Amino acid sequence: EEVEEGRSSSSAILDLPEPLLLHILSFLTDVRSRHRAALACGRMRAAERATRSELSLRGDPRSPGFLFLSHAFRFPALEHLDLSLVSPWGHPLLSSVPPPEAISEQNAFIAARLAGCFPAVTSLAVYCRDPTTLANLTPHWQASLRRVKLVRWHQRPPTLPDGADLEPLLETCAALRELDLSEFYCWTEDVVRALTTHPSATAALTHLDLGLAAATDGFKSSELGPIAASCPNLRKLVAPCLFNPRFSDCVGDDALLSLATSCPRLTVLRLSEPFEANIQREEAAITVAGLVAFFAALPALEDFTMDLQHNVLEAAPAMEALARRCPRIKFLTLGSFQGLCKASWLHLDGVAVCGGLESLYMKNCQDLTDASLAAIGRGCRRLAKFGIHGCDLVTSAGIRRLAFTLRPTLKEVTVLHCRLLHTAECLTALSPIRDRIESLEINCVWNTTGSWEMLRSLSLWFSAGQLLSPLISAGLDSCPVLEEISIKVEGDCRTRPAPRTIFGLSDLAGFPVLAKMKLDLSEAVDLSLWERFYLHGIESLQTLYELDYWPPQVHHRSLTLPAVGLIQRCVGLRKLFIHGTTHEHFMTFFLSIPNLRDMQLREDYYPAPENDLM
Template structure:
């Protein structure tokens, strides 16, 4: 019956709140809050997370949000994000375009960004951080990303008010030892701490924190803190017996610190290291003492050898995720030790390890039967048949990434296609020996493939995409720089992949309007498209695409001589959901700029 409320009259508040908690999408939650005043109030009560970017008056914004969302447990403040505040929160009023926008909150505080203190008001201050502590009494997690105006005084004030805090991220904040020590004294339930780029910290602050909350600390991240040395890690090893995750990026840390952690933190599950001064001695200790290790990532190591990986293979039987990046002295022998000793491995990434080649990959295929993701980047010693054992042994492989592996060709891709039929993601970039034959095999055998990227593989043409279109239902496709692909290949994708949501066809010189028409007809779910450097696409193709793909949110179309001001105007006016258009500045008319200036991004700007 028209005008009869079939929901509010029946459902109690508790049930509506529970429904809102299961709506994860923020736009969907916002839409729900617009239904009626009751739903608006209940939706605000159900929210537990807010994110705040750089704004004119973050302190006032914190107070405003706390009055509207009383049950917030997670607060993220990131001053790298440029987010403008609404001009007013009350009644609408006219604002002259000749002067900067100046708003006023209901509590009377200004939103002005001008004046002598304009810089200060655009950053969260100590008083604003204090307001976070006062306002969000249920707060469990706080992230302060590059909040440069927050000092030790503000952090102490906050810590004294939020003693139930469990997670703290201080990335890029200029806080010192006294502020961190206050956290250790007051926040005795702290579990996660991130200190990336906290340049003002020394061993004194971190040691005092560990003394206060070391028993509960489970995750610690330290990067680019030049005054934090082995002394801090020794304290971590002594007091943080429950530590499960350590991420360390330092040119100062030596073996002594990591040895202390390995011996003292036997529950360690995640270890990420970028420490140029650590050698085999420390990593061998990890293999001996950290028997619960599940993830190991080693970056830019120049002083350890296969002996370290041999120890990892012997001791860390639960290892599931291994990343080796720019580790110059590792060879096939070390990778073989890990593959043979860690049967639980599911993710392996080898990046720029120039002494690892075909034999190492064969060991992975032979022993790592549970492997689900493999990434090989800049591995020049891997030969054409390197992936044959992967295809035979890794039947559960779902994702394969290949970048600048010049020796890998069609034979390897055919082996993967025939053996790894559960493959869902295939990314290949600048592997110039891969051609139509390998990709055709993928289309014939890998029916679950949804994400395909073939960037700058210049031997791949239309025949490959025709096979993919006939055999797979793609959601993401990137064929940027595959200059042999033209209308026929993209038309096959348009007709065979109706679920396609992302498409990058940049630098395809033979692609024209016919492909755009077919995409409009066959891919109604398309949200993001990149057609830059496509010289044959004109306003006609753009007009058809914009009219048919009603969900389109972003379009990159620079260096397309066939697209004029009219095409740009069509895109921004026809697509109601468009959020970003990348185009040359001279193609944007004054009228288009007035109507959609906020979504236009320019390739070049005036100097």
Template sequence: MSNAAETTVRHLPEEILLKVFSGVSDTRTRNSLSLVCRSFYCFERRTRSSLTLRGIARDLYLIPTCFAHVTHLDLSLLSPWGHALLCSSSTADPHHLAQRLRDAFPRVTSLVVYAREPTTLHLLLLSPWPELRHVRLVRWHQRPPSSPAGSDFATLFSRCRSLTSLDLSAFYHWPEDLPPVLTANPAAAASLRRLNLLKTSFTEGFKSHEIESITASCPNLEHFLVACTFDPRYIGFVGDETLSAIPSNCPKLSLLHLADTSSFSNRSDDDGNGGEDARISHETLVALFSGLPLLEELVLDVCKNVRESSFAMEVLSKKCPNLRVLRLGQFQGICLAIGSKLDGIALCQGLRSLSIHGCADLDDMGLIEIARGCSRLVQFELQGCKLVTEKGLGTMACLLRKTLVDVKVSCCVNLDTAAALRALDPIRDRIERLHVDCVWNGLKDSDDNMGGGLLNFDLNDPNGGAEIMDCFGDEECEDPSKRKRQRCEYGLEGDDSLVQSNGNGYYGKNWDRLRYLSLWIKVGDLLNLLPVAGLEDCPNLEEIRVKVEGDCRGQPKPAESEFGLSILACYPQLSKMQLDCGDTRGYVLTAPSGQMDLSLWERFFLNGISSLSLNELHYWPPQDEDVNLRSVSLPAAGLLQECYTLRKLIIHGTAHEHFMNFFLKIPNLRDVQLREDYYPAPASDMSTEIRVGSCSRFEDALNRRHICD
């Protein structure tokens, strides 16, 4: 017995312990394991493959040297945030710092770095990591106008000839910089397998000839994501010629993402009924799909009408049998829904994820046909489809009850918040991720949202299924037994979970599995009605994102003192929040008489946040576009200071140094960052909001505090 009592987990074979530690991904858990004993410390360091550094790069002795097995290294968050990593102002010897980083992490294969100036990559790659394969560049500031064209990428491609993946989605640059560098380095370009150029800050994106040049230089691409424009009014728009060149130049593509830059804007009211058509013919779409047989993920967010696309979707289903993810923007006629025979996009039966944006002619019958054909959908997004109603979405939820766990419903005029939640009731106990718009349409605190039922037919009544049978195109069938057989065939009968309602059309009492909730709300509206609309019971909700959008200028002063964040205290497991007011515009200290400036609006938005037990908060302050400033105000800093449970605070903007000092009073705060990730970020360093010394002093004060765990 004594020997058994002395046997501990440390006595397990080394191979088993390495497997155990490799399976632990949570950073805090790994750190706790490393403190148990010396052997656990060694196992943790040997199995740590990813590391993100933060702190002050000027102190060389702070660079850890015990993570020699790390393969993914993220240097983009080193303080001072958003400034050059290797510059004389932050380090005495940038060459020495670069060498120390390479010596401390010799096995790096994936690198993320904030490269504000071309010299950063030049110094960092003087003696490149021999195994470096994946690079992600980050820059929120403007491209230095004095830099020669392509200087940001010249060093990268000349020194890293075996690079297989390059991500420029968060790198502020000019589209014309990249193609000449790829042409000048054919060996490095040919080794690329993944190229992400989906830059959301572009106004026009890559032009057609630039896309053709890039794809011609990189014939082995498997993943290609690019921001462009499909608007025929612009020079260099993407049309038939460019779409035909992509499969010819890169036939190995398994992921293709072409997005119009206007799709990055907030919300579109274009329903596809008007406006110009894209210069994309049916023949070109057929050729595109036929030339990419390995395609697994396709995004065509055109933002210009592509009409009568049903036949092209049928070709897509035949020519791309491995397709699993599909997103279409303003494609019309994707599903004709004539009779009970499947057509169009409904024939893509292998899809796991489907997003439909701005389809003006998609109605309930089309949605039901898509649900019948694409019976394996796990994720579904519906945006700007103004003919879809609660009945159609509810029937789709019934048909996809066994698979669907991730749903987004946005900009659909017939689906306000309450209607969308009622329609999703059949999967209420299964859904894990959800986005809805907060559109109340007269909903009041006293309203009872539980009445009315989900659908206007009874699945158990032989005569009550006539309406859904009409949707399936069997209007002439009047035999109740035949209708019953068809309901079994379509999956509406035989699953007890579909027919056991509580008498009012609802299939469950709470959202048991909901982990992530995303909300959009207009400036001036309140969150208080969220529980009344149907989201009152989410026992396992862990993360929420709230996006507030609109122009405060001209808005009357709110009658309530707070926006309604305190109502979120009804979710007991809520620990992470993203509060995005970045697209809320207003006045900064220039408000006319009778108008509120942004500091008062920030107080309105953040009132009540202290009642939430948050561990992590991402906050985008509202902005004044006239001065290109997104900064935390004094009331906002005071209210954020009251979030005593915070461990991580990310501000996507700027803040004065004395406002930042408020955060030092949060007892367990471990990580604070200022990210100027709005474009273009302010280039001046004269303000105390973004001065290097201010950021460094705050980081030092934060690290001097004692944190219990």
């Protein structure tokens, strides 16, 4: 006969050997929970500090408040350190360039303190205004620094020699393997000069991302050629390229084969064409026979993106080549490839033959049909993610049959700007996975005229002036686990909304766990009237916790006064990021919003405004 136990002095969790407590804490990735854990008791504080694996530094590490923290503020196991978000956002961090002997020993001090809190860093992200930031910041970590990510949305300092931005890394950091320049504005010449003149450093590199703030027209054949040739050990390459054959230095069959031959070990390759404006059907210098040879040189390839404006024609044989020569291919994104799957009755062809595919994304395939979708559904039984963008011959019946046939497996769907697929009809088409779909991305196009049980994430595209409200009637009325929403507005102000009409943000109020919003109006264009239109009713999203807001775009992007007022009524916000500026003092947000913690003005677009002097 069991008796009920009373108040106990012992704590099972604290009575575990301390290593087992560290092991538990190592599984806790929510930062707010980790901070809360450290506040529970002294032992959990030790466990939290001993096991934190990543941190994004908040505040100004030049301030006494940071430098004169206790030695208890120590993270001995921390691998990834992100300094790119330190205040004030985008200012020079530990630069030698004066905004003379004081700046040097103040720089040395901050660095030493950072190395004191973060002894074990193997990956660093840093906002990098000029190379002396790197010179001051890497001596403490040069032995162990494996991945470096550079962030700069500002103009390249105009007096720097070619490649100077990357020199301090390439001279000093012998453990460097991974270089992420996706958000780093520099010239393509900088990358070429640095990477072809440092063979010691460059021969060891395995991962390279060359997005360069999405502000270049693309790497040329004469730039990509030498870069590849100097990096024989590349396993991952992400780069924008010039593909327009009106330019003689464009990337074509020769430049592609030369990349594969110089970097035979590639597993991840993502090439894209920077999009201006108006290229629709103009052909690329990439041919099907060229791609056959190309894929045959890349037997380890697993993840392939070739996102073009310029067209590659009759690509099915190249897809069959991909399946045969790259037996590990799993992740495939193609833009402006034509003839991807013809779908003859007796056999599977093209992309339908790639049986190992887990993700498939197709843009601007003009001859992709319902028949094509039938073959892909029969051939690609492992598809977890499916997307189509600007595929004007696919119908709701193609989607519906694909969704039904791939029911065991399909979790993420994108349908964007497909001519025959309006929103209501496309939502109905997804019926076979209504109770299974985790992520959905669609553009909203209305017709004037079962819960989504597992839908965690929603991304929506709109034209300027268009309303959100009809989304509820269109079929997304019940979404019990929907926690994040992304809204992006395209087009120009050539349609004024009727007076007293609003976008309809308050119509998301019936989603019980919607905590996160991305509202991107940067490409949407009196600016205050438009902000009123889009933001009105944001206050009624009761569980809204994190907001990313991009105001409309004049080189500064300022929130108007009604925009500030409507955001300031979001009483649940814990995190607020404005990608642009405000005339308002940042404290008015902290005072209006009782539990606001993380707020920052992140001007993460090129060119970022210079605000340097006090």
